[PDB]
Write a protein that binds this ligand. Sequence first.
Ligand SMILES: Cc1cc2nc3c(=O)[nH]c(=O)nc-3n(C[C@H](O)[C@H](O)[C@H](O)COP(=O)(O)OP(=O)(O)OC[C@H]3O[C@@H](n4cnc5c(N)ncnc54)[C@H](O)[C@@H]3O)c2cc1C
Length: 372
Amino acid sequence: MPIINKILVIGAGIAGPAVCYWLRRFGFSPILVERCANLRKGGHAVDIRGVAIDLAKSMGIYKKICNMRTQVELGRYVDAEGNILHEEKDIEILRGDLVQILIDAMGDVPCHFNQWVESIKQRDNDVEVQFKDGRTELYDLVIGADGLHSTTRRMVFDKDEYKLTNLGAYFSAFSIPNYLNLNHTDVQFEANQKLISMASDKNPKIAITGFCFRAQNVLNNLRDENEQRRFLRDTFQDFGWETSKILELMSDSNDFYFDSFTQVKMKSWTKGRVALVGDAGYCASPFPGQGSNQALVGAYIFAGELKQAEGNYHRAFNRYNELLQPFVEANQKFGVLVNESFLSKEVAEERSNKIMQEIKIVSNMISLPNYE
Ligand SMILES: Cc1cc2nc3c(=O)[nH]c(=O)nc-3n(C[C@H](O)[C@H](O)[C@H](O)COP(=O)(O)OP(=O)(O)OC[C@H]3O[C@@H](n4cnc5c(N)ncnc54)[C@H](O)[C@@H]3O)c2cc1C
């Protein structure tokens, strides 16, 4: 039936650039748009596991990813005065490095920045997208790759067609000058169900920080970056160790990110000519560390099923939904299990090791169909 070619992909994270790669490789014409003025490369290291590694090999990015893998030599745990409590010592790679690798591998896929989708209107034979500058454009399909808080999901699906479950924890990531001269070293301070960390590895001039904490009934409006910064500053006031200096340097950080630990549950990730890929449809929260693997696997399956459906997008979408659902369900379950213990050392480590082993295993329990 009618050929599908022109496809809008909204968001340039992991899922968006990955699905553009596979759509273009399989003979479609994806167009990538991003709301931010440039690529957002902030964020902590991610773990590429299992069949996603085979995808990286097929994508010709495996060697690049191995070359960019994290080299941290020393984990260090300290108390509020900086006394050392303890020291320690699939691919782990900084999120931004993976984003750039995927963008680079994309080839000739137009990538547009500072783009604001206002509305998405499904018509008989296409989807009409209006942008906040008044422009209207037509696409055969539209893909939300826009993350946990997906604008696309909100425009396309009714509120009773998705459920966000906030698990009661929040995290932040941002970069600062490496003022403690950490050398391939990660330092972490934990107290009172809060956590702060700082690590310098890839770049000796820069340290990436992270914050983790639990909160309930948040009064603040956390959709705004300034309110996020404010809530973080207020939560960690008087926390100890290096928190004060880190929060001071945060004012000049250009890669700030803040979010909740939240799972997205939907009976379907697709509606008509619209599909969600990655956190937009299936976020499992950071707890199991599967966000990137889900994005990479979902991208491949989405594009493959579309290729084989030869115009029948509803059939492709149904198979996409069905084939990825078991992996997502497993990941979300493991996320909830991790939640139950997050914020004796031996018991805790033993329980954590079992879950991580099981996460590693299910990452290898996906069949990747042959689309070529
Ligand atoms: C800057 C950044 C930092 C992150 N840091 C961490 C971290 O440290 N730890 C962690 O566990 N997870 C982090 N995440 C989430 C993590 O990347 C995801 O869990 C997953 O790995 C990949 O999901 P995704 O590609 O579907 O969505 P995301 O990586 O969230 O990417 C979404 C992309 O869509 C863009 N976007 C959003 N709305 C619109 C719109 N209306 N129009 C166009 N584009 C839009 C975003 O700006 C972003 O580039 C981060 C996400 C971002 C964007």
